[PDB]
Amino acid sequence: ENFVPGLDGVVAFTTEIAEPDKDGGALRYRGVDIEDLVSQRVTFGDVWALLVDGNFGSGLPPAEPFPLPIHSGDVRVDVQAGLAMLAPIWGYAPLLDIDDATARQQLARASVMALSYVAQSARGIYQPAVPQRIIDEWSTVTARFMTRWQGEPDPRHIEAIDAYWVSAAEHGMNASTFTARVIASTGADVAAALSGAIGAMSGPLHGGAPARVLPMLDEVERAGDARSVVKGILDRGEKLMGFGHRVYRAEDPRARVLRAAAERLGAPRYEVAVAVEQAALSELRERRPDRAIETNVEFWAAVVLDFARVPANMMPAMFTCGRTAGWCAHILEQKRLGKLVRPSAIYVGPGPRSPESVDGWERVLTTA
Amino acid sequence: ENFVPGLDGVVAFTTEIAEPDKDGGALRYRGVDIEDLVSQRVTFGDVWALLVDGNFGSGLPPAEPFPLPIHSGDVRVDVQAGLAMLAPIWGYAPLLDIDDATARQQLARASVMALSYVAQSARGIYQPAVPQRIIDEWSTVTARFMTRWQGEPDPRHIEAIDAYWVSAAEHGMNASTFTARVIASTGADVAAALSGAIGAMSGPLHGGAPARVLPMLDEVERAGDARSVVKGILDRGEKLMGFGHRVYRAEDPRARVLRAAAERLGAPRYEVAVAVEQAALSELRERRPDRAIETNVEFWAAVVLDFARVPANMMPAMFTCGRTAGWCAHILEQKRLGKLVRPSAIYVGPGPRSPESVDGWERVLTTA
């Protein structure tokens, strides 16, 4: 026929959750801009509630003691499997059989427990757990995350993560968000939908690699040698990590608030990171002025996460931790919609044949 | 705008795997009809290879010893989590980094291991495992499944499962198949895509409940009292399990081969099940002749699975076991496509506002 495969540009839903204005250079959760939410130090628990409920009514409850049962050596796999396992032990009914208030409570409980699992998986099995009495000294979900992970958290490192999670909470109908909405549309339990979205998020096609810009930033020692290093990397036929074709028509507003938070909090890498950004951006727009070249959000996400002592293998899990807010918001919205997401396909394969006309049919009879 | 939410009737892919002819009353895997595949006693391992590879070249290798690590009390959850955990231990690279031959080998290894996990989870933890030397006495994947599950399998019970799995291997772009194709389109590992599809399959909206027709069949003792029982169930305002609006224009060809296999193998429930089918079908078309009423595939799937001593809580897992053939076929096809499945959405929510104009903003400042 006359169609392009991939559902590209096909409107699948109508949402009231968030609006990514790509030509206006803005990201608004329920109408509120993300810069307002970050600059006012609104914690992740409230932005979770704002995205899901639609207002600042009631935030996120604290997680319950639950030692992580999965130790696969992959933080993604640990939270993906551990989330699916919550339905039997906690008695999660399918979305068909529960009302909206029950689904919200189940989503908030699974969200806050995924954060507990990531902090436990990151801390590792070769270290004893942080006592729950120490974790309870803090009152926010992010502070408790750092305490369960590191033990004695630094408040500036908590503010960096609260800023990163808020800027990563929701960004439209990503493939993981679509997967969560599809699984939820079949009536399954909320834990089955969250677990499936994590599998989609683990895909490297869409996400960016924040841990790949850190080596380049380690080469440059002062703001001066940034131009020469960017010169050598481009002259050696390699690529510049953190820069490419624009996503928004101007810059990404998420890269805005991340860079601003890195400056406000006083990240040591900020002086060198700024010099590298202009040294890059300059070189790329001179070597190919025909393309719109901007700084990807992964560039300043690396500066913020590295400032909070987040290792390389932990950065992909830090994204998933914040993205649970948008996932639960779309799961609950998909529940109220009440429509199974079911596309169609066209057969272009072989016509009707007999089993004898298929190659290898002799092996079906020889080794029957 | 002027659109209906739900991606209904939107062609998303073009497949060469299988063709569900709904008006011609036929289901063909790569052009071969399912009745030919079942009547010729072609084992599930070959139909797996035919759907994935496109011919009868090389079938399914046997599973390796691997005690199931997940005991959640839900067979679905056990295979969903255990499949995701295979990537770290087995070194499954993302789909982006592996070639087609590697993806096929990884898919065949994860498929055959999911069958091992289901047989282990069904057998239960309160029973010692079947020795591997006993399992190795059999040469087909289905016979080894029954041996790992029951110990000493009955060949007629193996033929029933081989017939059921072949008829359940693939049926178009089901929401689980879509979920598998979406997750695979992000470049993730094959284990992450299979694990996500299982979460979608667990949804009760699309699948049917085979274990719900067994109680009705237990009431009717001879072929005679079938009409009276169907009379009482309809007169008591209840519903008739296993009958409803048609899926195919005539009958489902899957219900055809399942009923035929139940007759060919000599299922004890066959005489009563036939009488109940006509007693039902008669009553429904007389009480409402305006609708096309047919026997759902779940009705004869229950007779076949119950004949093979499959309990009620195990029947949903038996479907997933056979559906892995279609899942792997679409995962490998999605890999060769090379296009991220990414739809679009329209914001209809609140416009740009200030954080102070949101309800509950006082609680953000009071409990800051």
UniProtKB/TrEMBL annotation, chains A, B:
A Pfam family reported for this protein in Swiss-Prot or TrEMBL: Citrate_synt
Signal sequence range: none
BP GO terms, sorted: carbohydrate metabolic process; tricarboxylic acid cycle
Keywords: Acyltransferase, Allosteric enzyme, Transferase, Tricarboxylic acid cycle
Enzyme type, top EC level: transferase
InterPro entries to which the protein is assigned, alphabetical: Citrate_synth-like_lrg_a-sub (IPR016142), Citrate_synth-like_sm_a-sub (IPR016143), Citrate_synthase (IPR002020), Citrate_synthase_AS (IPR019810), Citrate_synthase_sf (IPR036969)
Molecular function per GO: citrate synthase activity
E.C. no: 2.3.3.16
GO CC, any one term: cytosol
Family annotation (Gene3D superfamilies): Citrate Synthase, domain 1, Cytochrome P450-Terp, domain 2
Pathway(s): Carbohydrate metabolism; tricarboxylic acid cycle; isocitrate from oxaloacetate: step 1/2
Family note: Belongs to the citrate synthase family.
NCBIfam families hit by this protein: PRK12350.1
Name assigned to this protein: Putative citrate synthase 2
Originating organism: Mycobacterium tuberculosis
Lineage: Bacteria, Bacillati, Actinomycetota, Actinomycetes, Mycobacteriales
Designated gene of the protein: citA
